[PDB]
Structure formats: structure tokens, C-alpha cells
Amino acid sequence: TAEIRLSDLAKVEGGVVDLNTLKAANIIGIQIEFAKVILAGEVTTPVTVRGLRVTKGARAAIEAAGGKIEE
Amino acid sequence: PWEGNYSSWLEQKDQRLAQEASQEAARRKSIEKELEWVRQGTKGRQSKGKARLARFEELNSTEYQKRNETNELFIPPG
Amino acid sequence: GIREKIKLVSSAGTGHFYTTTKNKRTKPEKLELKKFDPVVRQHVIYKEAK
Amino acid sequence: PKIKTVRGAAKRFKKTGKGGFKHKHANLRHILTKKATKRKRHLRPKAMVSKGDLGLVIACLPYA
Amino acid sequence: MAHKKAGGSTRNGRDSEAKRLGVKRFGGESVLAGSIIVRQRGTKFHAGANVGCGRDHTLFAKADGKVKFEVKGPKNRKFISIEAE
RNA sequence: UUUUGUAUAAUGGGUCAGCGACUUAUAUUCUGUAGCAAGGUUAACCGAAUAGGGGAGCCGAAGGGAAACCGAGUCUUAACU
RNA sequence: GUUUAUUAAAAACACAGCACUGUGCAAACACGAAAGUGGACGUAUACGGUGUGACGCCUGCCCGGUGCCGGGAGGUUAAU
RNA sequence: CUUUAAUGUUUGAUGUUCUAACGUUGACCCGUAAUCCGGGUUGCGGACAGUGUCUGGUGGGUAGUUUGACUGGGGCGGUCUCCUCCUAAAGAGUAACGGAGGAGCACGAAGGUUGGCUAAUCCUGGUCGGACAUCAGGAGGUUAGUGCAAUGGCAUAAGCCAGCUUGACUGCGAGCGUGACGGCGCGAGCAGGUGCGAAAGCAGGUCAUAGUGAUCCGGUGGUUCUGAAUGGAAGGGCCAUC
Ligand SMILES: [Mg+2]
Ligand SMILES: [Mg+2]
Ligand SMILES: [Mg+2]
Ligand SMILES: [Mg+2]
Ligand SMILES: [Mg+2]
Ligand SMILES: [Mg+2]
Ligand SMILES: [Mg+2]
Ligand SMILES: [Mg+2]
Ligand SMILES: [Mg+2]
Ligand SMILES: [Mg+2]
Ligand SMILES: [Mg+2]
């Protein structure tokens, strides 16, 4: 399991975030299966979270940026 | 356990108790002898020895006497 | 050293017990007290066990 | 070569956020009928390693 | 010359650890609630206003303020109170 | 030199010349200094081979809890003033 | 007679003699992973080990302890 | 079904006989001009002996080691952990093979409360009955008592008696004291439930200070916290305890 800061969502790709998509940007280890997005940094862009385990703080701070969280 | 009748079992029981009494008497003898040894001095700068002390300490043990009633039933004279 | 160790087992049905000592010679009758049971959060009867 | 961490120490201390080490209070393993519940309750939480013993711990745990 | 040396033995020689009794916060000292004032064995000092007594007869502050010592009472006993100062 | 303490009648050295004892791998923490900086840095390796590639990884920006898990909170607890 | 070459030559060791004990021969025993050797090209009047130590007069009592020998009934008891 | 008895059937034990494995350091023959070795006849033993694996016993024959410290030198004697007093110099602490004693528990009441009560000792009168038993009133005033050493304390009793009881609660805990740490101790108050009291209130063991043993390893109960592909489980962890 791994942690994802809100500052890494702008560092990944065009805007879709998933386990496979996070590894290709070298944010989590290639043998990581579960990731959680925490409220650590600040997200400015409309990022969509494909399948992950965002916290309530991270979730609100993503919708404020215009993002979307799904499974 | 025992295979036999009451009288044969009784005989076996007396033999068992006699052997136990003899072994207890031998234990008393050996304990007295080793106590006599313990109560001596070192005689020089030589051993005395802790192995024999340990043997005597473990030899000082407890045995269960038979709680046999036998002839004490006291009927007071009226 | 004649006070052996006993545990009072809750009668609430949960596995919970206080533990204490008891003179097994002078008090052969099993102990029985109404103590608190944090599992159910109610004062219930505890009975002596091994 | 790499320093071998004392493995027995790594089973009893965990590093905290600021660098201190947390451990589990002794005297809570057995012989618990004697001890009052007040004493046993206070020994249940984990404690922080003392200032004097921090040096001994850090040497035994150079990698964590 | 098997006479020069001599020896003996002793039957006492054991004591107990010291318990660090005595007054901890003296008169006029300002304390917080719960601070131990005197660690006694009996009741050399008795609990006064705003101070309490433990099972060891330890006198502790029940409020925060200055320690005071008094000899009030019909038996001329020393009492420790606390003034909320 | 060793000692509480040595002119010590305590140790060592006849004297000269030459040699003779805190080093070197790695790993880790701290200090100084230098570069970059929420980033820093590559290893093996490839290489017209002190360059340039190579970011596998490592450390860091998040912690709490034995853990699941939660997450600027978390654990304890039925709940915490 | 022997002995501590190099501070001890002796009352020490050995000794003939004595006793106990083991050993039936592919002997006991010893050396040797073993093969095999010695014992012994011997055979209980023989060989081994132990103690004592010419010779003379003798070698008293104790089998409880430790050991050894015999016994097999019963008890405890391994791997399976 | 119940007992029983018979021929069968399997199996197990013990025993006797046999030969064919195996042994032969018996004889003869051949390799071979060789008392080695091998092969062949034969005799004798014979599923014994012997060897391999496993196993019980014995095993200073051999091997590796252990065999504490303090100490008015070492050995010998004594001691080694805890509590009380003195040494200890009116805060704490403070050594000696200094001076004295104790502990390794007890108690479901000897704990909690609510009521009530107050001793030792002596004097006087009183049936056996006195030096001292129980009774009555007088002095006395805690010289008594405290589950057990000593010290401190205790009349509002902490001492003695009775009714009801289980707070000898569970989670915590401001703040302290004491330790080099491990640790140890005191604690108001908060939440949940409880006992006693009409209530105010008190109760998280006992008048206090001794009554003890880290960790590892393992045992028992509970808890799906974990569960090496997955669902379980085993094993772990957590809680309580041995
Ligand atoms: Mg039990
Ligand atoms: Mg001179
Ligand atoms: Mg000199
Ligand atoms: Mg640097
Ligand atoms: Mg005999
Ligand atoms: Mg025999
Ligand atoms: Mg040896
Ligand atoms: Mg009262
Ligand atoms: Mg309450
Ligand atoms: Mg009521
Ligand atoms: Mg499990």
C-alpha cells in the first residue's frame, strides 16, 4: 500500500489517475496494489480518480478543483 | 493394578509395604551418613565439593507415610 | 502459600473473568460476587472457576 | 559492509514522527493477579524511550 | 606459626532502602492541583482546606495555590491547607 | 611510565644512525562547506569511456495504530471534558 | 637386579612365590572403520588381568553401602 | 439379541524338524611349481550367528567445558532481594564483615458503607471463686488495641460491635513524588455501571511503610486484527491470565 499526495495528481498524465497510471509516472512502486490519496499538497486541475481510496479531506479538495472520483 | 484374589493381593501389599519401609530406613541411614559428612571441616585448602552438597540437598526429600488408622479408637470408660 | 489462584468467570455468557486468590481449605464453597462486566457493561454475577 | 541492525531491538522499538522511539511497558506479561488494575492499566499503552537510553537504542537501530 | 590470623562473623548488617519522606513543597510555595506536599508515614500533618490525604497519608493539593501550615485544633495538630493564590 | 603519591633504593633505556605504532574498505549518524531545492541523486550498465545517456532504485515532503484501517489526524475507549 | 639422561638409587619398581578372577579356541584380551595380526603355530599343568611379594607362623568378624556373579516371578520401561 | 461348544477361517505367540539363504579360522580338488584369495565337491552349523538402520541400558575408555562475588590477602565462616529504627551531622540522600529486628504472607472478611461504642491497670463489695474468670461502683485516662518486626500515626478513632453489601469496580486521568534507566508510588476529576446512607456524602482493597522476579519460550480463554493464488485454516498479533 502507498500514499498519494494531492500534489502528485498534476504530475501524472492528462488527468486520469489509477494504479497503473500512477506507476507510469513513478509516484508509487511498481509492486504497489493499493493507493490512498491524502490531503497533503494542493490540486488545481480537474483530475479524475479511476479507482483508489481518497480521504474525505482529499475528496473535497478534489471536487473543489473540479475533479471527479469514481471506482 | 493386580490380578488375583483378596488374600494374594494382601500378601503382595505386605511385601510392597515392607520393601517401602526398608527403602525408607536405608534413606534415613544414608541421610544421616551424608549429614555427618556435611558437618565436617574442609581440612586444608582442598575440595569439600559442591556436587556432594547438591546430592545431599536433593537427597533430603519427603516421603508420604500411610495415614493408617490402626488401634487408637478411643471409647471412654463410662 | 495456601491461597491458590482462582478466576471468577462472568455469568453474562462472555468470556471475561476477574482473578483472585482463595484459601481452598477454610473456604471450600465457591466464591460468588456481583462485579462489573465491561463486555456487557452491567454489574453481573461472577462465579468461581479453575 | 552495511551495518547489521540488532534484530532483537527492532522487535521492541518503533520510531515515532519526531525521531523518538516507542516501546511496550514491561511487567505486563505474567504474575498479574498480584498487580492492581490501576498498575496494569497504566502499563498497557506504549511509552517513549527515555533521554538516557536513547543513545543505546539509536546504536542498535541504525537503519530505523 | 599457625596462630597469626584470626576471624569471626556478624548477625546484623541489613537495612532497607530510604523512602524519601518529608515535606516536598514548603510553606508559601505556590503549587498546582495534585502536587504532593508531604510524604508521611502516619499523619504527622493533617489535611486542611483544599488539600487531601491519600492511602499512604500523602498530602496532595486539591486546588492550586500557596501552601500554608497551621497548628489549629483542640489537639494542637499541624494542618496543611491551601489558599487559592 | 605507573601511581594517592617517585630523587626514589619502583619500571625502561649502554650510545649513535636507520626503521617502529590510530590505517584502509564499505555502511551509518553529526558538523563544516559546495551545488540544486519540495525536490535531490543515480547504481550496474552503454559510451569516440572523468563527458553524455541510464531514475532500476534511494532518501524527502504524513502521521497514527500490533494490525486491518484511517489520514492532518490517528490510537485508546461504549465515548472521551 | 631396575629407576627419575642433566640436584632424588631409595624403604620406590621388579622379583621368584601366593591368591582372586576371566578365558573351551574363530579363547578371553589388544592393535586395527575393515581385512587381518599378536595372544600362539600355544589349548586350562595354557594364556590375560588384578592385588600381594622369598621363607616361617598365620591371614579373625562384617555382603548394610559401591561393584561383580546368579535368578527369574512380579512392577517400571525404547524403537515399533 | 444373551450366553456358551465344535469343524473352518484368518491372524499372533511359543516350540520341534528341515535346507535352500548365510557361516565355516573342517576335509579333499583346481587355478598353482602358493598353509593368501577365488571356484568346485563334501561335512558341520543353519534361518540361529553376523552385519546395516532405528532403539533402551551401560559407558571418565575418550572429548568439550563448568566449578560466583563481597572479603581490612585468599581459603574457611558469614552474606547476596525486600521492610523498620539508629549510625545519618534538625530538607532528601549517605558507607563499613557497623548496632538491633523482621518478610517471601493473611483476609470474601480482617474489604465498602451506615449506625453505635471506648481501653490497660488498680481499689472496694460479691456463691463455690483464689494473685488474677463473670458481677456492681470508684480511681485512672489509652500505660490498651491494631492480623504479623519496628517506626510514624490513630478519639472525628485507623481501635470494638451490628445491619446491608461487593468500589478487593471497567476505561481514563490534570498534576505530582522517586528513580541512571527498567520501573515504582500518590492522585483530584471525567465517563459507564454499583453498594451503603434519609441525605450531605464515602467506597478503584485493608492505619501506612515488607509479603517479591525483567525478558524469552510456552499454556488457557476471548477477539475474523492478520491469514504467502483464492475461500478457510494453521501460525501470528491484540486483550485477560497461567
Ligand atoms: Mg487460574
Ligand atoms: Mg642510586
Ligand atoms: Mg629508578
Ligand atoms: Mg552535507
Ligand atoms: Mg553387596
Ligand atoms: Mg544382575
Ligand atoms: Mg575430563
Ligand atoms: Mg462510625
Ligand atoms: Mg462513578
Ligand atoms: Mg439509595
Ligand atoms: Mg487466529
From TrEMBL, chain A:
Domain called Large ribosomal subunit protein uL15/eL18: residue spans? 11-70
Q: Name one GO biological process term.
A: translation
Q: Name one GO cellular component term.
A: cytosolic large ribosomal subunit
Keywords assigned by UniProt?
Answer: Metal-binding, Ribonucleoprotein, Ribosomal protein, RNA-binding, rRNA-binding
* Entry binding sites for Mg(2+) 4: 26
**UniProt GO molecular function:** rRNA binding; structural constituent of ribosome
Signal peptide range? none
**Record-stated family:** Belongs to the universal ribosomal protein uL15 family.
What binding partners and quaternary form does the record give?
Part of the 50S ribosomal subunit.
The protein's role, per its UniProt record = Binds to the 23S rRNA.
* Name of this chain's protein: Large ribosomal subunit protein uL15
Species lineage, top-down? Bacteria, Pseudomonadati, Pseudomonadota, Gammaproteobacteria, Enterobacterales
- Identify the segment of the full-length protein shown: 74 to 144 of 144
